[PDB]
Design a protein around this ligand. Structure first.
Ligand SMILES: CCCCCCCC/C=C\CCCCCCCC(=O)OC[C@H](O)CO
Ligand SMILES: CCCCCCCC/C=C\CCCCCCCC(=O)OC[C@H](O)CO
Ligand SMILES: [Hg+2]
Ligand SMILES: [Hg+2]
Length: 270
């Protein structure tokens, strides 16, 4: 069946690219164009399989996420840092504030940048940003572990998340670049962007799901669900592999891969 085969393909695409700094949105417009799945019903499909990849972070950081909102499951939480500090909900809130304000104020304007030419630019520019963060970051990270992050690092990563409102720029790309430029290690910066994505994306999809709720029907449920859990399985493999891969690899190959994806956006759409 075409409808479910496509749902599984977009599902693997979403689950790989959503948290890799490679622009899930960019990959979605190419593949959706190559599959023929591009209508209003596709943009609502591609936002609900985002919740699938969301759930993966939720599963992977279950005990950490609940500890931030005050629910400690009767065991000490695992410590990830060189200091006696602990990531707190304030870190998350500072990481959310700038992009929330800017995203609210400029909603209509942001929506009008969803062109394929803007996504092409955001792939190149965000790749350059990754290169710059890799070239400019300190020799010795100030926050080697997630629990070493400061309010200032969290807030600055939060301002960098405004760049993510640029369609194609990749939320994880913006926030990991900012993290490394603020002396956060690749690993903790990845971890912090995944944690930050949870409130960000769950309010993003909820917002999109409300404004686009009219499209959903009874028959979407088969398609909407095959993509959802595909994005969940793939994201769980992607995130766990990425967190182990980035320990040894840098972001240069992702930046270069972004440039190849930019070329594809031009080949496919122009
Ligand atoms: C859904 C469309 C496809 C999704 C696109 C995914 C993006 C990956 C692109 C570039 C990263 C390349 C880096 C990953 C390759 C590393 C493999 C490897 O073996 O490197 C490990 C190294 O040996 C350490 O010890
Ligand atoms: C809008 C979004 C903004 C995107 C930023 C665009 C281009 C940055 C590329 C410039 C990278 C060049 C920096 C290299 C450098 O100067 O390195 C210095 C030295 O290595 C350290 O001690
Ligand atoms: Hg350099
Ligand atoms: Hg900002």
């Amino acid at each position: 069946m075409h409808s479910l085969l496509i749902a599984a393909i977009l599902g693997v695409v979403e689950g790989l690219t959503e948290f890799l700094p490679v622009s899930s949105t960019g990959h979605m417009i190419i593949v959706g164009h190559l599959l023929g799945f591009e209508g209003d019903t596709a943009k609502t499909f591609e936002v609900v399989i985002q919740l699938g990849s969301i759930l993966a972070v939720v599963v992977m950081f279950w005990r950490r996420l609940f500890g931030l909102i005050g629910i400690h499951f009767g065991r000490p939480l695992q410590h990830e840092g060189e200091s006696k500090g602990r990531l707190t909900l304030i870190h998350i809130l500072l990481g959310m504030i700038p992009a929330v304000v800017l995203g609210l104020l400029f909603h209509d304007t942001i929506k009008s940048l969803f062109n394929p030419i803007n996504v092409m630019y955001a792939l190149v520019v965000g790749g350059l940003l990754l290169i710059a963060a890799e070239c400019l970051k300190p020799k010795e990270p100030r926050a080697p572990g997630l629990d070493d992050m400061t309010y200032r690092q969290a807030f600055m990563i939060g301002c960098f998340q405004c760049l993510a409102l640029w369609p194609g720029f990749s939320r994880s790309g913006a926030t990991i670049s900012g993290g490394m430029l603020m002396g956060v290690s690749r690993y903790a910066a990845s971890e912090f962007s995944f944690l930050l994505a949870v409130p960000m994306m769950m309010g993003a999809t909820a917002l999109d799901l409300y404004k686009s709720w009219g499209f959903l029907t009874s028959g979407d449920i088969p398609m909407f669900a095959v993509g959802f859990i595909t994005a969940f399985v793939v994201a769980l493999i992607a995130i766990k592999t990425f967190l182990q891969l980035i320990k040894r690899i840098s972001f240069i190959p992702f930046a270069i891969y972004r440039f190849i994806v930019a070329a594809a956006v031009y080949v496919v759409f122009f």
